[PDB]
Design a protein around this ligand. Structure first.
Ligand SMILES: Cc1nc([C@H]2CN(c3ncnc4[nH]cc(-c5cccc(C#N)c5)c34)CCO2)no1
Length: 291
């Protein structure tokens, strides 16, 4: 039996037109598409069920997590469709690129960092209030619309807390952004995303997370052992303090996403998301001139 496949639909090519590959997500490739009813563009993640073996359990979970989320700060999921051996996961299309792509041309200023962080924080506050942990917070999983709207994506390793399960222990995430308690596979909760957010703040400020030049197996001992990273360089005192607050080895000392929305760094520097179109244009100009 399948509880999370209650709303599984059929015949997706009757309502959608599949177009070109735009990238990769957890367990499958993502394609551009069109909703034939509205003419709006969508993202269509295709998961080949034949090639899937142990990830099948997580694929059922990813559909469930995306279906249980309804927020402007999380990529909307429009439905899952079964077509022969292929599962289509219809998602909100976001044409502005990821925060990681927007870092490719050069550094961000502190207004841009604060704006991106505030929107990530609203997404985290939403998820954490619904007892969900993203577990893969990093600039690559932060997507923008063509108008600068910022949303969380890729719920492939997302965790769910329940009344019977108050903590998780699974070794999941991207090593450079993982919380120490996650690597140690100790009992953890939403505070693990607050650590990941602090690493993401360093990544938005410096362009790369701490230890980025090291093999990921080495960071698996360095992170639990070393003092937590700090933001080094000529950055404002509130930004350094925002990073420091997130990167506490003791998870209970990390503030919540709700508390961080009131941080001096966010309050002083975050501006309208529409201003982020300047970063999206910088990326387009940069990409067009690359050899
Ligand atoms: C390079 C490069 N990589 C890419 C990104 C683009 N990306 C999207 N592009 C547009 N609208 C979207 N809506 C949802 C996503 C999305 C992103 C990440 C994970 C998941 C999942 N699961 C979904 C998305 C798909 C991944 O590759 N573009 O250039």
């Amino acid at each position: 039996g399948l509880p999370g496949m209650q709303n599984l639909k059929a015949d997706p090519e009757e309502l959608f037109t599949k177009l070109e590959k735009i990238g990769k997500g957890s367990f499958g490739e993502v394609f551009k598409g069109i909703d034939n009813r509205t003419q709006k563009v969508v993202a269509i993640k295709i998961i080949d069920l034949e090639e899937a073996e142990d990830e099948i359990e997580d694929i059922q979970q990813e559909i469930t997590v995306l279906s249980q989320c309804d927020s402007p700060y999380v990529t909307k999921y429009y439905g899952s469709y079964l077509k022969d051996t292929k599962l289509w996961i219809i998602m909100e299309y976001l044409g502005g690129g990821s925060a990681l792509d927007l870092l490719e041309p050069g550094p961000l200023d502190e207004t841009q960092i604060a704006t991106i962080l505030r929107e990530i924080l609203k997404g985290l506050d939403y998820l954490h209030s619904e007892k969900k942990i993203h577990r893969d917070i990093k600039a690559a999983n932060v997507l923008l619309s063509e108008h600068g709207e910022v949303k969380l994506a890729d719920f492939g390793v997302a965790g769910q807390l329940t009344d019977t399960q108050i903590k998780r222990n699974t070794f999941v995430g991207t090593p450079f952004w993982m919380a120490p308690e996650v690597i140690k596979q100790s009992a953890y909760d939403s505070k693990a995303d607050i650590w990941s957010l602090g690493i993401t703040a360093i990544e938005l400020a410096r362009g790369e997370p701490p230890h980025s030049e090291l093999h990921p197996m080495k960071v698996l001992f360095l992170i639990p052992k070393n003092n937590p990273p700090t933001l080094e360089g000529n950055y404002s005192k509130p930004l350094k303090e925002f990073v420091e607050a997130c990167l506490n080895k003791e998870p209970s000392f990390r503030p919540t996403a709700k508390e961080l929305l009131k941080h001096k760094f966010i309050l002083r520097n975050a501006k309208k998301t529409s201003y982020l179109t300047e970063l999206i244009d910088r990326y387009k100009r940069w990409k067009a001139e690359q050899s």
